Protein backbone atom coordinates (compact mmCIF):
# COMPACT_ATOMS: atom_id res chain seq x y z
CA UNK A 1 0.00 0.00 0.00
CA UNK A 2 2.83 2.28 0.61
CA UNK A 3 3.50 2.43 -3.33
CA UNK A 4 0.45 4.92 -3.10
CA UNK A 5 1.68 7.17 -0.87
CA UNK A 6 5.20 7.26 -2.56
CA UNK A 7 3.36 7.71 -5.99
CA UNK A 8 1.10 10.72 -4.54
CA UNK A 9 4.26 12.41 -2.69
CA UNK A 10 6.31 12.15 -5.91
CA UNK A 11 3.83 13.84 -8.24
CA UNK A 12 5.64 15.95 -10.64
CA UNK A 13 2.04 18.69 -10.49
CA UNK A 14 1.08 20.37 -7.26
CA UNK A 15 -1.78 22.20 -6.14
CA UNK A 16 -2.98 25.24 -4.64
CA UNK A 17 -7.06 26.43 -4.07
CA UNK A 18 -7.81 29.53 -3.87
CA UNK A 19 -11.42 30.30 -3.95
CA UNK A 20 -12.46 28.86 -6.79
CA UNK A 21 -9.16 28.70 -8.48
CA UNK A 22 -6.72 26.22 -8.73
CA UNK A 23 -3.34 27.11 -8.91
CA UNK A 24 -1.00 24.48 -10.51
CA UNK A 25 2.37 24.38 -10.66
CA UNK A 26 4.84 22.08 -12.75
CA UNK A 27 7.50 19.72 -11.00
CA UNK A 28 8.40 19.18 -14.67
CA UNK A 29 12.06 20.48 -15.84
CA UNK A 30 11.63 19.82 -19.76
CA UNK A 31 8.30 18.88 -20.40
CA UNK A 32 4.59 20.92 -21.13
CA UNK A 33 2.01 19.06 -20.04
CA UNK A 34 1.25 17.37 -23.47
CA UNK A 35 -1.32 14.35 -22.17
CA UNK A 36 -2.32 16.32 -19.18
CA UNK A 37 -6.05 16.15 -18.68
CA UNK A 38 -7.04 17.82 -15.19
CA UNK A 39 -10.51 15.98 -13.93
CA UNK A 40 -11.98 17.76 -11.18
CA UNK A 41 -15.38 16.65 -9.07
CA UNK A 42 -17.35 18.09 -6.28
CA UNK A 43 -19.04 15.93 -3.69
CA UNK A 44 -20.76 16.18 -0.69
CA UNK A 45 -20.41 12.68 1.52
CA UNK A 46 -19.75 11.03 -1.26
CA UNK A 47 -22.57 12.77 -2.87
CA UNK A 48 -21.20 13.75 -6.39
CA UNK A 49 -22.82 17.09 -7.42
CA UNK A 50 -20.46 18.28 -10.26
CA UNK A 51 -17.66 17.62 -12.11
CA UNK A 52 -15.59 18.82 -15.10
CA UNK A 53 -12.50 18.47 -16.94
CA UNK A 54 -9.62 20.55 -17.89
CA UNK A 55 -6.16 20.35 -20.00
CA UNK A 56 -3.25 21.31 -18.84
CA UNK A 57 -0.93 23.44 -20.35
CA UNK A 58 1.59 24.25 -18.15
CA UNK A 59 5.23 24.45 -18.51
CA UNK A 60 8.17 22.86 -17.11
CA UNK A 61 8.16 25.11 -13.64
CA UNK A 62 5.65 26.78 -14.65
CA UNK A 63 1.77 27.83 -13.21
CA UNK A 64 -1.56 27.14 -14.78
CA UNK A 65 -4.80 28.77 -13.27
CA UNK A 66 -8.04 27.49 -12.80
CA UNK A 67 -11.24 29.03 -13.09
CA UNK A 68 -14.29 27.16 -11.67
CA UNK A 69 -17.41 27.50 -12.39
CA UNK A 70 -19.86 28.50 -9.80
CA UNK A 71 -19.73 25.65 -7.24
CA UNK A 72 -23.24 24.26 -5.87
CA UNK A 73 -24.36 25.14 -2.14
CA UNK A 74 -26.25 22.25 -0.84
CA UNK A 75 -28.72 22.93 1.58
CA UNK A 76 -27.95 19.60 3.40
CA UNK A 77 -25.59 18.79 5.72
CA UNK A 78 -22.45 17.43 5.61
CA UNK A 79 -18.73 17.94 3.96
CA UNK A 80 -18.01 19.28 0.63
CA UNK A 81 -15.30 18.23 -1.23
CA UNK A 82 -13.60 18.97 -3.93
CA UNK A 83 -11.23 16.69 -5.68
CA UNK A 84 -8.73 16.67 -8.64
CA UNK A 85 -7.00 14.10 -10.27
CA UNK A 86 -4.78 14.38 -13.44
CA UNK A 87 -4.66 11.96 -16.68
CA UNK A 88 -2.78 10.78 -19.13
CA UNK A 89 -5.68 10.51 -22.28
CA UNK A 90 -2.96 8.61 -24.66
CA UNK A 91 -0.69 6.09 -23.58
CA UNK A 92 2.92 6.07 -23.22
CA UNK A 93 5.76 3.90 -23.48
CA UNK A 94 5.33 3.41 -19.92
CA UNK A 95 2.07 3.90 -19.29
CA UNK A 96 -1.80 3.56 -20.67
CA UNK A 97 -3.84 5.69 -21.64
CA UNK A 98 -6.01 7.18 -19.19
CA UNK A 99 -3.44 6.63 -16.57
CA UNK A 100 -3.47 8.88 -13.15
CA UNK A 101 -0.47 10.69 -12.24
CA UNK A 102 -1.26 13.04 -9.43
CA UNK A 103 -4.22 13.74 -7.59
CA UNK A 104 -5.52 16.24 -4.15
CA UNK A 105 -8.48 17.14 -2.54
CA UNK A 106 -9.79 19.32 -0.56
CA UNK A 107 -12.94 20.33 1.72
CA UNK A 108 -14.68 23.36 1.37
CA UNK A 109 -17.48 23.30 3.77
CA UNK A 110 -19.11 21.85 6.46
CA UNK A 111 -22.97 21.77 7.30
CA UNK A 112 -23.57 20.46 10.73
CA UNK A 113 -26.58 19.10 11.63
CA UNK A 114 -28.78 20.78 13.52
CA UNK A 115 -31.47 18.33 13.34
CA UNK A 116 -33.21 15.83 15.54
CA UNK A 117 -34.20 12.68 16.02
CA UNK A 118 -37.84 12.30 15.64
CA UNK A 119 -39.82 10.90 18.37
CA UNK A 120 -40.11 7.05 19.14
CA UNK A 121 -43.81 5.34 19.39
CA UNK A 122 -41.62 3.49 22.27
CA UNK A 123 -38.82 2.65 24.60
CA UNK A 124 -36.48 -0.11 25.09
CA UNK A 125 -37.28 -2.38 27.98
CA UNK A 126 -34.75 -3.21 30.83
CA UNK A 127 -34.58 -6.20 32.42
CA UNK A 128 -32.42 -7.09 35.38
CA UNK A 129 -30.98 -10.60 36.37
CA UNK A 130 -28.44 -11.02 38.65
CA UNK A 131 -25.83 -12.38 36.14
CA UNK A 132 -26.58 -9.61 33.37
CA UNK A 133 -29.41 -6.50 32.06
CA UNK A 134 -30.96 -7.21 29.14
CA UNK A 135 -32.23 -4.53 26.80
CA UNK A 136 -35.07 -5.58 24.18
CA UNK A 137 -37.00 -3.29 21.74
CA UNK A 138 -38.73 -5.29 19.39
CA UNK A 139 -36.58 -7.97 17.72
CA UNK A 140 -33.61 -6.50 19.19
CA UNK A 141 -31.90 -7.27 21.99
CA UNK A 142 -28.77 -6.50 23.98
CA UNK A 143 -26.81 -7.81 27.02
CA UNK A 144 -24.69 -6.46 29.19
CA UNK A 145 -22.62 -9.00 31.48
CA UNK A 146 -23.01 -7.66 34.73
CA UNK A 147 -19.50 -9.11 36.20
CA UNK A 148 -17.54 -8.58 33.28
CA UNK A 149 -19.29 -5.07 32.39
CA UNK A 150 -19.42 -5.62 29.24
CA UNK A 151 -21.49 -5.98 26.35
CA UNK A 152 -21.43 -9.96 25.84
CA UNK A 153 -24.43 -10.47 23.08
CA UNK A 154 -26.97 -8.76 20.83
CA UNK A 155 -29.75 -10.73 18.64
CA UNK A 156 -31.49 -9.83 15.67
CA UNK A 157 -34.29 -12.02 15.82
CA UNK A 158 -33.31 -15.48 16.93
CA UNK A 159 -29.81 -14.65 15.71
CA UNK A 160 -26.74 -13.70 17.90
CA UNK A 161 -24.46 -11.14 16.31
CA UNK A 162 -21.42 -11.66 18.11
CA UNK A 163 -18.76 -14.62 18.85
CA UNK A 164 -17.28 -12.34 21.35
CA UNK A 165 -17.71 -9.53 23.74
CA UNK A 166 -16.91 -6.11 22.86
CA UNK A 167 -14.42 -4.21 24.13
CA UNK A 168 -11.49 -2.13 24.93
CA UNK A 169 -8.47 -2.75 23.19
CA UNK A 170 -5.27 -0.93 23.72
CA UNK A 171 -2.44 -2.60 22.07
CA UNK A 172 -1.94 -3.82 18.28
CA UNK A 173 0.15 -7.02 16.27
CA UNK A 174 3.64 -5.24 16.80
CA UNK A 175 4.72 -4.13 13.27
CA UNK A 176 8.03 -4.64 11.99
CA UNK A 177 8.66 -1.28 13.15
CA UNK A 178 7.36 -1.49 16.43
CA UNK A 179 9.48 -4.73 16.89
CA UNK A 180 12.57 -2.68 15.48
CA UNK A 181 15.59 -5.21 14.67
CA UNK A 182 18.27 -5.14 12.25
CA UNK A 183 20.06 -8.29 13.51
CA UNK A 184 18.22 -11.15 14.96
CA UNK A 185 21.03 -11.22 17.71
CA UNK A 186 20.84 -7.55 18.99
CA UNK A 187 17.37 -6.76 20.76
CA UNK A 188 16.41 -3.16 21.92
CA UNK A 189 14.67 -2.37 25.25
CA UNK A 190 13.87 0.54 24.03
CA UNK A 191 11.69 -0.78 20.83
CA UNK A 192 8.12 -0.33 21.20
CA UNK A 193 7.24 -3.38 21.85
CA UNK A 194 9.64 -4.27 24.14
CA UNK A 195 8.51 -1.97 25.95
CA UNK A 196 5.18 -2.50 25.88
CA UNK A 197 5.76 -6.02 26.95
CA UNK A 198 7.60 -4.86 29.54
CA UNK A 199 4.59 -2.70 30.75
CA UNK A 200 2.52 -5.59 30.46
CA UNK A 201 0.20 -3.89 28.20
CA UNK A 202 -0.11 -7.23 26.12
CA UNK A 203 -0.91 -8.63 29.16
CA UNK A 204 -3.60 -6.19 31.50
CA UNK A 205 -6.13 -7.28 33.67
CA UNK A 206 -9.47 -5.25 33.04
CA UNK A 207 -11.04 -4.69 36.42
CA UNK A 208 -14.93 -3.31 36.68
CA UNK A 209 -14.98 -0.45 38.45
CA UNK A 210 -18.36 0.38 38.46
CA UNK A 211 -21.71 -1.27 36.09
CA UNK A 212 -24.85 0.40 36.02
CA UNK A 213 -28.52 0.52 34.21
CA UNK A 214 -30.63 3.12 34.30
CA UNK A 215 -34.50 4.20 32.75
CA UNK A 216 -34.73 7.41 31.46
CA UNK A 217 -37.97 8.98 29.67
CA UNK A 218 -36.36 7.99 26.16
CA UNK A 219 -34.15 5.69 26.60
CA UNK A 220 -32.02 3.23 28.39
CA UNK A 221 -28.49 3.86 30.02
CA UNK A 222 -25.97 1.63 30.57
CA UNK A 223 -22.40 2.84 33.09
CA UNK A 224 -19.59 0.83 33.01
CA UNK A 225 -15.88 1.81 34.25
CA UNK A 226 -12.30 -0.38 33.93
CA UNK A 227 -9.36 -0.49 35.25
CA UNK A 228 -6.44 -2.22 33.52
CA UNK A 229 -3.91 -3.03 35.69
CA UNK A 230 -0.64 -4.93 35.82
CA UNK A 231 1.23 -5.53 39.26
CA UNK A 232 -0.63 -3.38 40.99
CA UNK A 233 -0.20 -0.74 38.28
CA UNK A 234 -3.26 0.93 36.71
CA UNK A 235 -2.82 1.44 33.44
CA UNK A 236 -5.55 2.72 32.15
CA UNK A 237 -9.25 3.44 32.87
CA UNK A 238 -12.19 3.69 30.96
CA UNK A 239 -15.52 4.47 31.37
CA UNK A 240 -18.04 4.49 29.33
CA UNK A 241 -22.31 5.15 28.63
CA UNK A 242 -24.29 3.27 26.04
CA UNK A 243 -27.55 4.62 25.62
CA UNK A 244 -30.31 2.87 23.80
CA UNK A 245 -32.86 4.90 22.57
CA UNK A 246 -36.38 3.90 20.51
CA UNK A 247 -34.96 4.29 17.90
CA UNK A 248 -33.16 0.73 18.64
CA UNK A 249 -29.60 2.79 18.04
CA UNK A 250 -27.06 1.96 20.59
CA UNK A 251 -24.62 5.04 21.50
CA UNK A 252 -21.26 4.93 23.17
CA UNK A 253 -19.22 7.18 24.31
CA UNK A 254 -15.66 6.09 25.72
CA UNK A 255 -13.06 8.36 27.98
CA UNK A 256 -10.01 7.01 28.66
CA UNK A 257 -6.99 8.01 31.19
CA UNK A 258 -3.74 6.75 30.18
CA UNK A 259 -0.92 6.66 33.50
CA UNK A 260 1.40 9.16 32.05
CA UNK A 261 4.41 7.08 33.28
CA UNK A 262 3.29 4.56 31.19
CA UNK A 263 4.51 4.23 27.52
CA UNK A 264 2.06 5.32 24.89
CA UNK A 265 -0.35 2.79 23.87
CA UNK A 266 -0.78 1.41 20.50
CA UNK A 267 -4.05 2.42 20.23
CA UNK A 268 -7.12 2.89 21.73
CA UNK A 269 -10.29 1.18 20.96
CA UNK A 270 -12.83 -1.64 20.55
CA UNK A 271 -13.11 -4.78 19.07
CA UNK A 272 -15.53 -7.65 19.14
CA UNK A 273 -15.53 -10.52 16.53
CA UNK A 274 -18.67 -10.69 14.79
CA UNK A 275 -21.18 -13.99 14.30
CA UNK A 276 -21.87 -12.62 10.94
CA UNK A 277 -19.29 -12.30 7.56
CA UNK A 278 -19.83 -10.91 4.86
CA UNK A 279 -18.67 -9.79 1.05
CA UNK A 280 -18.38 -6.37 1.13
CA UNK A 281 -17.20 -3.13 3.40
CA UNK A 282 -18.60 -0.29 2.73
CA UNK A 283 -17.75 3.09 4.27
CA UNK A 284 -17.12 6.97 4.30
CA UNK A 285 -14.08 8.05 5.02
CA UNK A 286 -10.52 7.57 3.34
CA UNK A 287 -9.88 5.01 1.68
CA UNK A 288 -9.97 3.28 -0.74
CA UNK A 289 -6.45 1.59 0.66
CA UNK A 290 -5.05 0.75 3.83
CA UNK A 291 -3.85 4.12 5.60
CA UNK A 292 -2.25 5.10 8.81
CA UNK A 293 -2.26 8.22 10.70
CA UNK A 294 1.41 9.08 9.86
CA UNK A 295 0.48 7.87 5.78
CA UNK A 296 -2.00 8.90 4.72
CA UNK A 297 -2.08 12.05 2.27
CA UNK A 298 -2.32 9.46 -0.55
CA UNK A 299 -5.78 8.18 0.81
CA UNK A 300 -9.33 10.12 -0.48
CA UNK A 301 -12.46 10.82 1.49
CA UNK A 302 -14.99 8.98 0.21
CA UNK A 303 -17.48 6.90 -0.40
CA UNK A 304 -15.39 3.55 -0.72
CA UNK A 305 -16.98 -0.09 -1.23
CA UNK A 306 -14.58 -3.09 -1.24
CA UNK A 307 -14.60 -6.77 -0.93
CA UNK A 308 -13.57 -8.20 2.26
CA UNK A 309 -10.61 -9.74 0.88
CA UNK A 310 -9.47 -6.28 0.14
CA UNK A 311 -9.57 -5.36 3.59
CA UNK A 312 -6.38 -7.16 4.70
CA UNK A 313 -3.04 -6.75 3.74
CA UNK A 314 -0.89 -10.36 3.08
CA UNK A 315 2.43 -8.51 4.36
CA UNK A 316 4.65 -11.39 4.32
CA UNK A 317 5.39 -11.26 8.07
CA UNK A 318 2.22 -10.34 9.60
CA UNK A 319 0.90 -7.90 12.15
CA UNK A 320 -1.55 -5.06 12.30
CA UNK A 321 -3.04 -3.73 8.91
CA UNK A 322 -5.42 -2.64 6.90
CA UNK A 323 -6.56 0.21 8.96
CA UNK A 324 -8.64 3.05 7.57
CA UNK A 325 -8.45 6.47 9.21
CA UNK A 326 -11.16 9.04 9.39
CA UNK A 327 -13.92 7.32 8.98
CA UNK A 328 -17.09 8.67 9.63
CA UNK A 329 -19.25 5.66 8.38
CA UNK A 330 -18.98 1.82 8.26
CA UNK A 331 -21.04 -1.01 7.25
CA UNK A 332 -20.99 -4.36 7.39
CA UNK A 333 -24.05 -6.69 7.30
CA UNK A 334 -26.92 -5.40 8.99
CA UNK A 335 -24.67 -3.24 10.51
CA UNK A 336 -23.88 0.06 10.63
CA UNK A 337 -21.33 2.14 12.79
CA UNK A 338 -21.15 5.92 12.68
CA UNK A 339 -18.56 8.79 14.09
CA UNK A 340 -15.25 9.47 13.74
CA UNK A 341 -12.92 6.82 13.93
CA UNK A 342 -10.51 4.56 12.11
CA UNK A 343 -10.76 0.99 11.68
CA UNK A 344 -10.03 -2.78 10.88
CA UNK A 345 -11.71 -5.64 9.78
CA UNK A 346 -10.74 -8.92 8.93
CA UNK A 347 -10.71 -12.55 9.59
CA UNK A 348 -7.88 -12.78 12.00
CA UNK A 349 -7.66 -11.77 15.27
CA UNK A 350 -4.47 -9.79 16.71
CA UNK A 351 -3.48 -12.59 18.68
CA UNK A 352 -3.43 -14.70 15.93
CA UNK A 353 -1.56 -12.24 13.48
CA UNK A 354 0.55 -11.47 16.37
CA UNK A 355 1.38 -15.06 17.17
CA UNK A 356 1.99 -16.33 13.33
CA UNK A 357 5.48 -15.47 11.34
CA UNK A 358 4.30 -16.35 8.08
CA UNK A 359 1.20 -15.18 6.28
CA UNK A 360 0.98 -18.79 4.14
CA UNK A 361 0.15 -19.89 7.92
CA UNK A 362 -2.67 -17.88 8.98
CA UNK A 363 -5.91 -18.88 8.90
CA UNK A 364 -9.40 -17.32 8.99
CA UNK A 365 -11.23 -16.99 12.12
CA UNK A 366 -14.80 -18.03 12.96
CA UNK A 367 -16.58 -14.63 12.22
CA UNK A 368 -14.80 -11.36 11.36
CA UNK A 369 -13.10 -9.74 13.35
CA UNK A 370 -13.44 -5.85 14.16
CA UNK A 371 -11.23 -3.59 15.45
CA UNK A 372 -12.92 0.14 16.07
CA UNK A 373 -10.04 3.09 17.03
CA UNK A 374 -10.54 6.29 18.48
CA UNK A 375 -7.18 6.46 17.84
CA UNK A 376 -4.32 5.00 16.42
CA UNK A 377 -0.32 5.39 16.95
CA UNK A 378 1.58 6.34 13.71
CA UNK A 379 4.03 3.62 12.05
CA UNK A 380 6.93 5.17 11.54
CA UNK A 381 9.88 3.71 9.25
CA UNK A 382 12.66 6.47 9.48
CA UNK A 383 14.59 3.39 9.76
CA UNK A 384 13.18 0.11 11.16
CA UNK A 385 15.60 -0.86 14.21
CA UNK A 386 14.49 1.95 16.46
CA UNK A 387 11.67 4.27 17.29
CA UNK A 388 11.04 6.16 14.41
CA UNK A 389 7.71 7.23 15.26
CA UNK A 390 7.37 11.40 15.46
CA UNK A 391 5.87 12.14 18.34
CA UNK A 392 3.08 13.83 16.70
CA UNK A 393 1.91 10.66 15.97
CA UNK A 394 2.53 8.70 19.36
CA UNK A 395 -0.93 8.82 21.76
CA UNK A 396 0.56 10.55 24.61
CA UNK A 397 -2.34 12.97 25.44
CA UNK A 398 -3.47 10.92 28.30
CA UNK A 399 -7.25 11.39 28.22
CA UNK A 400 -8.83 10.56 25.19
CA UNK A 401 -12.57 10.51 24.12
CA UNK A 402 -14.40 9.20 21.53
CA UNK A 403 -17.75 8.24 20.51
CA UNK A 404 -20.08 5.90 18.64
CA UNK A 405 -23.31 5.19 16.99
CA UNK A 406 -24.25 1.47 16.50
CA UNK A 407 -27.75 0.38 14.47
CA UNK A 408 -28.82 -2.18 11.86
CA UNK A 409 -31.08 -2.35 9.26
CA UNK B 1 -27.21 30.78 20.54
CA UNK B 2 -30.79 28.36 20.08
CA UNK B 3 -31.92 25.75 22.06
CA UNK B 4 -32.34 22.76 20.20
CA UNK B 5 -33.27 20.48 23.30
CA UNK B 6 -33.21 20.53 26.87
CA UNK B 7 -34.14 17.71 29.51
CA UNK B 8 -34.70 16.56 32.90
CA UNK B 9 -34.22 13.19 33.97
CA UNK B 10 -33.70 11.00 37.41
CA UNK B 11 -31.49 8.79 37.70
CA UNK B 12 -31.23 6.08 40.97
CA UNK B 13 -28.82 8.41 42.10
CA UNK B 14 -28.54 11.59 40.64
CA UNK B 15 -30.74 13.95 38.42
CA UNK B 16 -29.40 14.48 34.99
CA UNK B 17 -30.27 17.26 32.87
CA UNK B 18 -29.33 17.28 29.13
CA UNK B 19 -29.04 20.55 26.87
CA UNK B 20 -28.02 21.16 22.84
CA UNK B 21 -27.08 24.73 21.43
CA UNK B 22 -26.50 25.83 18.04
CA UNK B 23 -24.71 29.18 17.23
CA UNK B 24 -26.01 30.50 14.44
CA UNK B 25 -24.88 33.31 12.21
CA UNK B 26 -27.13 33.99 9.16
CA UNK B 27 -28.34 30.94 8.76
CA UNK B 28 -24.99 29.24 8.81
CA UNK B 29 -24.51 27.21 11.91
CA UNK B 30 -21.33 27.92 14.04
CA UNK B 31 -21.02 25.60 16.20
CA UNK B 32 -23.29 22.81 18.39
CA UNK B 33 -22.99 22.55 22.11
CA UNK B 34 -24.07 19.35 23.82
CA UNK B 35 -24.09 19.00 27.52
CA UNK B 36 -24.81 17.02 30.62
CA UNK B 37 -25.45 17.69 33.86
CA UNK B 38 -24.73 15.57 36.38
CA UNK B 39 -25.91 15.92 40.47
CA UNK B 40 -25.49 13.56 42.56
CA UNK B 41 -26.33 12.97 46.46
CA UNK B 42 -23.28 13.89 46.83
CA UNK B 43 -24.28 18.19 45.81
CA UNK B 44 -21.59 17.74 42.76
CA UNK B 45 -22.53 19.00 39.57
CA UNK B 46 -20.75 17.39 37.15
CA UNK B 47 -20.67 18.55 33.20
CA UNK B 48 -19.68 17.42 30.41
CA UNK B 49 -19.19 19.45 26.80
CA UNK B 50 -18.64 18.46 23.39
CA UNK B 51 -18.66 20.75 20.89
CA UNK B 52 -18.86 20.73 16.90
CA UNK B 53 -17.04 23.29 15.04
CA UNK B 54 -18.20 24.01 11.45
CA UNK B 55 -14.56 22.89 9.10
CA UNK B 56 -15.60 26.20 7.31
CA UNK B 57 -15.61 28.57 10.14
CA UNK B 58 -12.54 30.37 11.46
CA UNK B 59 -10.90 28.68 14.41
CA UNK B 60 -12.15 29.69 17.34
CA UNK B 61 -10.14 31.74 20.28
CA UNK B 62 -11.50 29.36 22.76
CA UNK B 63 -13.91 26.78 24.12
CA UNK B 64 -15.23 27.46 27.32
CA UNK B 65 -18.01 28.58 29.57
CA UNK B 66 -18.09 31.50 31.72
CA UNK B 67 -20.47 33.41 33.97
CA UNK B 68 -20.73 36.25 36.35
CA UNK B 69 -20.31 34.66 39.90
CA UNK B 70 -22.29 37.11 42.86
CA UNK B 71 -19.13 36.72 45.24
CA UNK B 72 -15.80 38.35 45.45
CA UNK B 73 -13.16 36.90 47.37
CA UNK B 74 -9.46 37.56 48.73
CA UNK B 75 -7.76 34.88 47.41
CA UNK B 76 -7.45 32.15 44.65
CA UNK B 77 -5.78 29.40 44.69
CA UNK B 78 -5.58 26.52 41.95
CA UNK B 79 -3.67 23.96 41.64
CA UNK B 80 -2.07 23.93 38.13
CA UNK B 81 0.65 26.61 36.10
CA UNK B 82 1.48 29.34 37.79
CA UNK B 83 1.91 31.17 39.11
CA UNK B 84 1.98 33.87 36.42
CA UNK B 85 -0.55 34.37 33.34
CA UNK B 86 0.70 31.82 30.95
CA UNK B 87 -0.74 30.63 27.63
CA UNK B 88 -0.83 27.33 25.34
CA UNK B 89 1.83 28.61 22.76
CA UNK B 90 3.35 30.78 26.03
CA UNK B 91 3.98 28.38 29.07
CA UNK B 92 7.46 26.72 29.68
CA UNK B 93 8.09 28.83 32.28
CA UNK B 94 5.25 28.23 33.93
CA UNK B 95 5.50 25.50 37.27
CA UNK B 96 2.40 23.03 38.01
CA UNK B 97 1.91 23.32 41.21
CA UNK B 98 -0.37 24.88 44.07
CA UNK B 99 -0.45 28.52 44.10
CA UNK B 100 -2.16 31.02 45.58
CA UNK B 101 -2.92 34.69 45.25
CA UNK B 102 -4.95 37.90 45.65
CA UNK B 103 -7.49 38.58 42.87
CA UNK B 104 -5.51 41.30 42.03
CA UNK B 105 -2.77 39.56 40.72
CA UNK B 106 -4.66 37.56 38.48
CA UNK B 107 -4.97 40.15 36.16
CA UNK B 108 -2.91 41.45 33.36
CA UNK B 109 -2.89 45.68 33.10
CA UNK B 110 -1.61 45.78 29.67
CA UNK B 111 -2.09 49.67 28.70
CA UNK B 112 -4.52 48.57 25.77
CA UNK B 113 -6.71 45.90 27.24
CA UNK B 114 -7.11 43.09 25.81
CA UNK B 115 -7.91 39.26 27.32
CA UNK B 116 -5.27 38.14 29.78
CA UNK B 117 -4.79 36.54 32.90
CA UNK B 118 -5.48 33.36 31.80
CA UNK B 119 -3.78 29.83 33.28
CA UNK B 120 -3.48 26.51 31.89
CA UNK B 121 -3.06 23.17 33.30
CA UNK B 122 -5.17 23.38 35.89
CA UNK B 123 -6.88 20.93 37.47
CA UNK B 124 -8.51 22.44 40.57
CA UNK B 125 -9.95 25.87 41.48
CA UNK B 126 -11.02 27.29 44.28
CA UNK B 127 -12.87 30.91 45.26
CA UNK B 128 -14.90 31.50 48.06
CA UNK B 129 -17.25 28.38 48.82
CA UNK B 130 -16.19 27.34 45.10
CA UNK B 131 -13.79 24.60 43.96
CA UNK B 132 -14.16 22.79 40.15
CA UNK B 133 -12.24 20.17 39.25
CA UNK B 134 -10.58 18.82 35.81
CA UNK B 135 -8.32 20.06 33.40
CA UNK B 136 -8.80 22.99 32.16
CA UNK B 137 -7.62 26.88 31.73
CA UNK B 138 -9.07 29.48 32.79
CA UNK B 139 -8.90 33.51 33.88
CA UNK B 140 -10.82 35.49 36.68
CA UNK B 141 -11.41 39.25 37.33
CA UNK B 142 -13.51 42.23 37.59
CA UNK B 143 -13.95 42.95 33.79
CA UNK B 144 -16.07 40.69 31.09
CA UNK B 145 -14.45 39.88 27.92
CA UNK B 146 -17.21 42.74 26.35
CA UNK B 147 -15.45 45.49 28.69
CA UNK B 148 -12.30 44.91 27.90
CA UNK B 149 -12.86 44.54 24.47
CA UNK B 150 -15.07 47.55 24.67
CA UNK B 151 -12.14 49.92 26.80
CA UNK B 152 -9.12 51.60 25.13
CA UNK B 153 -6.96 52.36 28.15
CA UNK B 154 -6.57 50.64 31.49
CA UNK B 155 -7.51 53.81 32.69
CA UNK B 156 -11.06 53.44 32.08
CA UNK B 157 -12.02 49.97 33.39
CA UNK B 158 -13.94 49.73 36.06
CA UNK B 159 -14.68 46.88 38.09
CA UNK B 160 -17.96 44.86 37.58
CA UNK B 161 -20.47 43.82 40.12
CA UNK B 162 -18.87 40.37 40.83
CA UNK B 163 -16.47 38.26 39.36
CA UNK B 164 -16.33 37.02 36.15
CA UNK B 165 -15.20 33.75 35.35
CA UNK B 166 -13.96 31.85 32.35
CA UNK B 167 -13.48 28.07 31.98
CA UNK B 168 -11.72 27.10 28.84
CA UNK B 169 -11.69 23.58 27.48
CA UNK B 170 -9.62 25.28 25.05
CA UNK B 171 -7.58 28.07 24.15
CA UNK B 172 -6.04 29.22 20.64
CA UNK B 173 -2.72 30.30 21.26
CA UNK B 174 -1.31 33.58 21.15
CA UNK B 175 1.32 34.18 19.01
CA UNK B 176 4.09 37.30 18.46
CA UNK B 177 6.58 36.45 15.75
CA UNK B 178 5.56 39.86 14.35
CA UNK B 179 2.47 41.55 15.11
CA UNK B 180 0.74 42.59 11.88
CA UNK B 181 0.19 39.16 10.32
CA UNK B 182 -1.39 35.82 11.63
CA UNK B 183 1.25 34.44 13.77
CA UNK B 184 -0.04 32.19 15.60
CA UNK B 185 1.21 28.38 15.06
CA UNK B 186 -0.83 25.73 13.32
CA UNK B 187 -0.43 23.53 16.66
CA UNK B 188 -2.05 26.30 18.52
CA UNK B 189 -5.37 26.40 16.41
CA UNK B 190 -8.24 25.25 17.40
CA UNK B 191 -8.55 23.34 14.48
CA UNK B 192 -9.57 20.05 15.44
CA UNK B 193 -13.31 20.04 14.42
CA UNK B 194 -14.58 18.21 17.59
CA UNK B 195 -14.07 19.45 21.78
CA UNK B 196 -14.56 17.91 24.36
CA UNK B 197 -14.41 18.26 28.23
CA UNK B 198 -15.58 17.75 31.90
CA UNK B 199 -15.80 19.39 34.82
CA UNK B 200 -16.49 19.11 38.50
CA UNK B 201 -17.98 21.71 40.46
CA UNK B 202 -18.68 21.94 44.19
CA UNK B 203 -19.01 23.88 47.31
CA UNK B 204 -17.25 23.76 50.93
Known sequence: ?????????????????????????SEYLF??????????????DGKPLASGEVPLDVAPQGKQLIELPELPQPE?????????????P???????????????????????????????????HLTTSEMDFCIELGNKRWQFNRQSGFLSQMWIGDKKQLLTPLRD???????????GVSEA??????????????????????????????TLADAVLITTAHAWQHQGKTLFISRKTYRIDGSGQMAITVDVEVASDTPHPARIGLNCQLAQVAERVNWLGLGPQENYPDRLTAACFDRWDLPLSDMYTPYVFPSENGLRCGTRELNYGPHQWRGDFQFNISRYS???????????????????????????????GDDSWSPSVSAEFQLSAGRYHYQLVWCQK
Open 31 to 44: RHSDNELLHWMVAL
Open 169 to 179: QFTRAPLDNDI
Open 185 to 214: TRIDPNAWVERWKAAGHYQAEAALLQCTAD
Open 90 to 124: NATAWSEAGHISAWQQWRLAENLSVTLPAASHAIP
Open 350 to 380: QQQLMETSHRHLLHAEEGTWLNIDGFHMGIG
Open 1 to 25: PALTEAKHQQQFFQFRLSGQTIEVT
Open 76 to 88: SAGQLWLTVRVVQ
